[PDB]
Design a binder for this molecule. Structure first.
Ligand SMILES: O=C(c1ccc(O)cc1O)c1ccc(O)cc1O
Ligand SMILES: O=C(c1ccc(O)cc1O)c1ccc(O)cc1O
Ligand code: NA
Ligand code: NA
Lengths: 116, 116, 116, 116
């Protein structure tokens, strides 16, 4: 698992379950091409997005559909989505965790990059 | 000010000065049209991006150029930028403050929305 | 202002108004002595806590009464309060802003420290 | 494991390893009594603090020694420590995760409370 996404809910103090997540890779013509996607599990996590072979150096975008998440809870949110844009670099540690902590008008995101 | 951006640096405990900010608005053909840009002052604030007349209903993207900020300070950060995407003024004119708190591998953003 | 506190609400996208704040200073016997208190204004800010003369070197604790804020809004939050503990003025007088961003099960705090 | 603590480093994008953590329980005389302690592991986590039998309803304080962590990295930080104060309540879900994301002048904390 070179890439994992984890999403938490700061209002309820829980994992954010069944949140849609889309990953894109920047193409040579500077457009975003679909790369991988899924929905967070009951632990707020999305595993199995890619493989080491497929996850080469490049610029990636992780788009978390926060608006649908809040609307399903009956809460009007601010953002259309949360976007996390970063470069994957081989010199750095192997495994990337992209974490996001969600509130209706705010989000935090951090990267935990470690060596297996 | 209908739209203001404020940026803080969590490493130095200071405003984030001379941070470039680009604002885009989604056009009728679904592309991101350049809308306004500027850079943060010594107080970490960016005022004067737009006017009440210009700042119509729409979907807006505020791109904060965090990578260039950390690199101009001689540090190699994780993200390319921080993006904040939101619908504005769809219930009439509001004042928006987009605030961000930056670290090299993490950022937080929140919105303060007031009715004049 | 040698010491200012600013508080935002991540659920409502607004300043956090009428939040009680208590400041303490560690005494020579290691106990926490009451130092100053107040509540945030309509802008979410609390000014006038202390003076340059009064705000000597020491270890200070700023207690932000988040539970009472969420409960006065009719919500049951996780934390009792948010505490911010720091040494101040040990290299001479500085200006301190303690900022906090609140959600029912989470909060963020940062400091902006400037030299007059 | 009714109580787990997880600590992340927002500057390096890594778990915060070997961070001292102390847990206290509020006594009837309103003083803080030591309850459990340890150091975070190579994953930034501290497990095994308490048992279901021992972790009764009450007010608890988790104190994370952030100052020593930053000093060991050669970084001058702002806070003496990060403190998280909360009530344990049986009506709510069983397992508490207290997470903290650290920067030199800022920290975020959230609670993830779930049902096994
Ligand atoms: O609360 C967070 C968290 C992160 C990882 C984890 O295993 C558990 C967490 O609660 C968290 C995530 C992203 C962020 O930007 C800030 C956070 O406190
Ligand atoms: O606490 C914050 C804050 C920042 C600027 C300000 O004028 C007031 C604040 O409470 C804050 C704002 C945005 C964010 O992503 C994280 C924060 O702690
Ligand atoms: Na409308
Ligand atoms: Na001194």
């Amino acid at each position: 698992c070179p890439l994992m996404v984890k999403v938490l809910d700061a209002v309820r103090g829980s994992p954010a379950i069944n949140v849609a997540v889309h990953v894109f890779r920047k193409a040579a013509d500077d457009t975003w091409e679909p790369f991988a996607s899924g929905k967070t599990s009951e632990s707020g996590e999305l595993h199995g997005l890619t493989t080491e072979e497929e996850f080469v150096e490049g610029i990636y975008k992780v788009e978390i559909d926060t608006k649908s998440y809040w609307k399903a809870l009956g809460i009007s949110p601010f953002h259309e989505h949360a976007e996390v844009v970063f470069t994957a670099n081989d010199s750095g540690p192997r495994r990337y965790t992209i974490a996001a902590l969600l509130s209706p008008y705010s989000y935090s995101t951090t990267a935990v990059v470690t060596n297996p």
